[PDB]
Amino acid sequence: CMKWDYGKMEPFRATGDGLFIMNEGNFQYGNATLSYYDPETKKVENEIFYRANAMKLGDVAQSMIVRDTIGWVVVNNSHVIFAISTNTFKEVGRITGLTSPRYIHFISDEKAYITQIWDYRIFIVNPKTYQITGYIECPDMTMETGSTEQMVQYGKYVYVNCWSYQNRILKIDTTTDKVVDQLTVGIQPTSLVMDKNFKMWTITDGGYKGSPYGYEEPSLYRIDAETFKIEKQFKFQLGDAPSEVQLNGAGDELYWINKDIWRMSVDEERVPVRPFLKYRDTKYYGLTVSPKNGDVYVADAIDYQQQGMIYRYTEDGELVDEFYVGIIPGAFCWK
Amino acid sequence: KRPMKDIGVQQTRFDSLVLKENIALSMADILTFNSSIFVKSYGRATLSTVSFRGTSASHTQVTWNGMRINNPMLGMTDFSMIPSYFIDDASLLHGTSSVNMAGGGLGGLVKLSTVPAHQEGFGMQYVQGIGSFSTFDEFLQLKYGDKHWQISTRAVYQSSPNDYKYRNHDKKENIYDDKYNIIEQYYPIERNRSGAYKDLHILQEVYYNTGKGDRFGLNAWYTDSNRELALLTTDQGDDFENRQREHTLRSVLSWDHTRENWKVSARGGYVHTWLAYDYKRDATMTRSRSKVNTFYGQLDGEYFFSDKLLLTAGVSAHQHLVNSLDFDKGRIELSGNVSLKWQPVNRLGMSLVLRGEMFGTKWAPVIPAFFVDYVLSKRGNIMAKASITRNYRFPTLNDLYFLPGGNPALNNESGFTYETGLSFSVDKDNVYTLSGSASWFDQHINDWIIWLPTSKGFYSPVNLKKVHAYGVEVQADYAVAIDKAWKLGLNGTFAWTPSINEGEPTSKADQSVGKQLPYIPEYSATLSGRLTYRSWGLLYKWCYYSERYTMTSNAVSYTGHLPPYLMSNVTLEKGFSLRWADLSLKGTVNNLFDEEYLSVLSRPMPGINFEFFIGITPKWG
Ligand code: CNC
């Protein structure tokens, strides 16, 4: 008439240049999970972090950045960003005390700005000491609407889009650690990415019709790099909520969900009518493109209450592999 | 001595000593240990959800003094906000029996009432609860009666910082070095954060009797609560508060006019409910205000044609008004029922119940129900019974008018239920008293309301979700007198309740078909024991829940596993009779074996904890 459990570590060895599926998990349930898939042996390893550390990842596992041979794991709903070995999936350090981190970009081996939600300060941390250094003050920007997201380096400046309850792009100078420019874009820009033609690529979700901030037709934007200025705009009518823009290894073809995953080349002029994928019957959530071969991995959330799947297609559309991961897969990172 | 109203009905009743044993036990703690019901409750002073006979929370209708108490927006009630001493008589109606009194009770019905007192003169009671974790509980009682009046007043206050020591088997704290490297890992022992709470409950009762068959009453039940939301087990990092205040006033007026042959009852009531959500940290980060205005009315009749035949009629009407902001919606709820009970010979018994429901502007189909009872053998009171019905549950007010996702075109869920049971009652005079029952139930639910995402980008219920619920429920009560001063009582309940999702696969690859529903244990059993010797009292309570699945697919995962839940609570009571007062001393030990357990995913649990009560009942002239 008793109970037991506790965890037991097991050895892990990264045998190939695998892919890290960044499972978000539910929200206010603490069921975030991390997974590893090997594109060559066609074998997927789920719950790599729990089995290799005997302690759970957290809640709302957001994104992962791999630098050199170390991988940084962001847990949004636990104020913690990890640092794990990319070979044995073991913890070597952590950064805690954050407010609500989303994304991390390393300016150098010393400075790594961290984005947040529900806050207008961008954390500055030292990866080698796991200690908070300073904050970056975002103008006209408050806690009740706090939002920071994807950062893209361009020479000496970092561009970040303010997603949640925000409609502005911020350009940050790394040397002086202060914003220097701003552009006003549509409601709630989701993700920001960089191409070869030096044209900033992003989309704006309409967002939650009836929202206090407002409701609008989602759009797509292209922004010049050298001169921070809008260049071209696309409209995607009033339906659907686009998200998760991506590129390929060559940085010349654009991918985004908008129900029908759209595979369209860079420096085009119109949205192709045909869908790269038909948006069959489920609710896709994640998207990535291989930088070494060209495979397309599409993360399916199914019904948010069971294991999702990633569908692996080639650059032509040939089905290759369909494997299962944790609850609500949300992001990818390449080892 | 079967009551005619209780013909072919599977129900259980909680005795006085079951409800009046501790002042810290809400109805969540009562149902967990005293029945086979699954109660999803991750601790004390927390959101408790009841899943009954394999169904969801919304399929358990709750009525206090006749009027329905379920939240109009959600359709489900938090059983942890109802103190046990505020309930003087409670009953459970299983499945088809909920037709006799309520409407869309696909799972079952919980009926709560306060019997009038029988105390002459002035009296008082005061008990104080001194417990671990810096938890304090109080309960004050004031009563009076003069053969034509029964005035009562209760006030229950419970407060605690609610910060207990638990060991994290889901988090690990590291020991750094001189060069910010790693040295050793260890499972930390931390304290519950943001779990502080304080609750106030006041119940005022006025009962009037005329002595000519007319009885009057007025019950007012005011509730003030201020509970915070506990942090997750793996919630480390930082200047934080998150509270859910809740103000509720529930009033019921009653008048009963009995006669020599027939009886008519009329009741009316009013409920004001106000919820506030606050999320702030060092700033009005999030706000939410919910206001509910509710009016109630009911008229009931009951006529005897003879000792063998009985007819009843009843009309009810609820009116919910909601102005949730920080939008205007309402619904009238008529419910007429007619029942006829015929008892041809001493062994046979039939009962037919017809119900009519009209919620808002849509008419539900006629709700029939047949109850039959037969006596197999009077040697051991072997009695078998069977019932069958088709019941309908209307969509909740949220699913209809939820502004970004409301579809007022939903169809009410339908459920076909049939069950067969047996019972026995063999007792020996002042030696032993054994009774128990076993019933097999089978139910199919169609058009189960399931919120699902839409292509536009919002959520909307789409019915579907055929569900098959069936199983076996067993009850057993035992009492024995070992010696002239030792009395032993044993109460045991057992239930095997699968809940299979029979619906079509929503997508190409869903492992949910043919699987158990989330957070419903396949097996369940409870056992309670009581031994008393003179003024010494020892009580033992034990509950068992099988594995609970956290995913629809029932997939095996290391990070989503919930082991079978076995808990043991023991309490020793001693009573002292002084000259001017009576003192009752009891001490409660919860989590007796001190297992670092887990009943809800990634939510911390306390260890072994103690609770001490001091009870004073003055003895006047
Ligand atoms: C679909 C969804 C989700 N959402 Co919204 C997004 N994008 N959401 C929505 C959509 C509608 C939800 C709905 N109720 O119809 C959508 C896009 C409109 C929406 C909107 C919002 N969401 C927001 C955010 C950022 C979040 N959302 C997620 C919960 C993000 C979720 C990600 C995730 N991993 O869970 C999400 C993908 C899955 C929710 C779900 O269905 N869960 C399963 C469901 C069956 O269980 P559940 O727990 O009962 O789900 C309820 C809640 O999650 C609730 N909910 C949804 N969003 C929020 C936000 C908050 C603060 C709260 C308390 C509840 C919610 O929706 C469900 C009931 O419909 C989030 C984890 C996404 C992320 N990766 O950061 C994030 C929470 C961030 C954080 N650290 O707290 C918005 C501020 C964005 C915006 N401006 O549109 C806004 C919040 C509204 C508010 N209250 O102020």
Automatic annotation (TrEMBL), chain A:
This is Surface layer protein. Cyanocob(III)alamin 1 binds at residues 24-25, 27, 76, 102, 118, 164, 188. It comes from Bacteroides thetaiotaomicron (strain ATCC 29148 / DSM 2079 / JCM 5827 / CCUG 10774 / NCTC 10582 / VPI-5482 / E50). Cyanocob(III)alamin 2 binds at residues 24-25, 76, 102, 118, 164-165. Cyanocob(III)alamin 3 binds at residues 24-25, 76, 102, 165, 188. It holds the Pfam family DUF5074. It comes from the Bacteria. InterPro entries: DUF5074, Haem_d1_sf, Host-pathogen_enzymatic-act, WD40/YVTN_repeat-like_dom_sf.
